[PDB]
């Protein structure tokens, strides 16, 4: 919309869709909350305002996240790109798209909001 | 000094109001004012600015772009964040070096980490 | 888990202060009153993910110090200063990739720079 | 393109010759002018220019201030270098953004440096 | 020993250029005409300190894969991308801290990138 | 110097000092070669115009080039450092001074004058 920043949220469980949901809520974001990388995907495509993109590394089924950050860049290749992962980071360094971050599990509220924050300031 | 002051300039009392309050729960001290105009003279007159956040246009001139020039020219070190609903392109020939420019709309946390990050890298 | 500050300021007020702050913001805080305790607790292999230190305190040794031990455990530990007096010595004396804040700074400008150093780690 | 050409503009003929010569070297085409005047004839005659390289200042008006104005306009991301004997003081109030500054005096390596890194970071 | 760039590049002419440009500056180059062959030459547990590779081959895999398998081995493998056609693809495709080179390009600007992603390593 | 830039440089070993010499003076440097650490200290405490710095971490004796970098930044807060070391360059994280370069051996003709250059524009 006009009024508000729209960031993608793409998570697979309940406790942690709705605890970044309400993160990003409280710091004045739009979110559309989806639970794959399949529905992250569909939601690009399909035109909505999207403008930045929070998601997991893995869903139960494939497309990951890494393939959902692709197909962001191909709508906007501006596009605010932050990861959420449980272990492995280090897959970031040959997957993770250019000017991305990638958030480790444990991070806190203030770290999410400074990685989106600071993405969208970048875009020029 | 005890405080950090910003200087909040933008026409829409609305988004006045909104930065002034994001800023002061932020903990900076904000004289929050609705012209170019305006901002120059408290520029002009010696108050203790530490950043200056700016719309890039007002309904008369001096415009944002003049209100960046007179803040570096006091200060050459001074924090400038650029607010427009255009005009990146603008930006590029009329912005001023190391400053950040925010297209409407953006968050409360997009304003505060832009503020904190450019009075964070001073020297 | 949780992602863990070692903050060190031997002003109680300010220790308090900045405890608050960066509690608020999701961060475990171990906060202590000198930097021989700070490197104390460094030295413990208790889990610290940032460091936030004064420059000078009461006893010896100074902030300057506490950042350099941090480093020799963690060459990318995130490692925030807290001055008032001299931040030009931050040039000489500050470590790679390091933030000095000169007083009076913001809660957010804690929050941010902390935020920004720890993420920076990818 | 088949070439990467650099506009340079000083008023100093050594100088102007000394940075054409290690460009060129470097592998770039070079656009050599005098005047800032020139070099916004240059830039408004529509020749494809890749980078401007200029001295803030010149014996008349326009200012390498308003050259990379001019530059800018065409080009939002051209890459800027300005060159001074001065005048880091009036680049934090004039200066366009991401642009570098050299103050003289400064090596042909560095020269180099500066705009391979300007092209390299663009888009 | 020395510093080594893996080249890819599927034009000989081009090759030949890149290759000089970066021996001159006093590289050790590997020189290679595909991408299958510079992962063959990056999983054979040679020393490679960077990679310079265009995006697309005449054969299978594309310069994109041949960053990806650069950075498994080495995840902060300085990675040089050459182009032609579509740069706009890095934005999708390229790994983080690449540096993309569109042509025209100079021999300056490919020294400048390569030196400066092997100096950010520190 | 008015018309030229002047880099103190301070290594150890004849063959890599005039090795690193005539690097930088080919890129277009004045080169003042010292082969000490506290030699120096001397010149930079002695008011000799210098532009940037290229030391060693390790001499013959004390002091070493992690003091020579302090000492240089007490001059001048925003002065170039560039630091030359065989081995350990993990030091570094602990040791150097903000915003400075280590170069690990090996390192090339091109990468030394990069980091100098880069340095030396990055004064603004």
């Given at each position: 919309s006009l009024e508000a920043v729209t960031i993608l949220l793409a998570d697979d469980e309940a406790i942690l869709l709705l605890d970044f949901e309400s993160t990003l809520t409280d710091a004045g974001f739009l979110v559309t909350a989806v639970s794959s990388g399949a529905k992250a995907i569909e939601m690009l495509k399909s035109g909505a305002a999207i403008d930045g993109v929070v998601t997991d590394?893995?869903?139960?089924?494939?497309?990951?996240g890494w393939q959902v950050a692709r197909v962001a860049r191909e709508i906007d290749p501006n596009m605010p790109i932050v990861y959420i992962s449980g272990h492995a980071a280090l897959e970031w360094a040959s997957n993770g798209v250019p000017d991305s971050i990638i958030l480790e599990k444990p991070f806190t509220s203030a770290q999410l909001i400074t990685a989106v924050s600071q993405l969208l300031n970048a875009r020029e």
């Amino acid at each position: 919309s006009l009024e508000a920043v729209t960031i993608l949220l793409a998570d697979d469980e309940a406790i942690l869709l709705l605890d970044f949901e309400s993160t990003l809520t409280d710091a004045g974001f739009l979110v559309t909350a989806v639970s794959s990388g399949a529905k992250a995907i569909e939601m690009l495509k399909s035109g909505a305002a999207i403008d930045g993109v929070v998601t997991d590394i893995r869903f139960c089924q494939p497309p990951d996240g890494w393939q959902v950050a692709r197909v962001a860049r191909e709508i906007d290749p501006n596009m605010p790109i932050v990861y959420i992962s449980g272990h492995a980071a280090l897959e970031w360094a040959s997957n993770g798209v250019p000017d991305s971050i990638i958030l480790e599990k444990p991070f806190t509220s203030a770290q999410l909001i400074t990685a989106v924050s600071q993405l969208l300031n970048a875009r020029e």
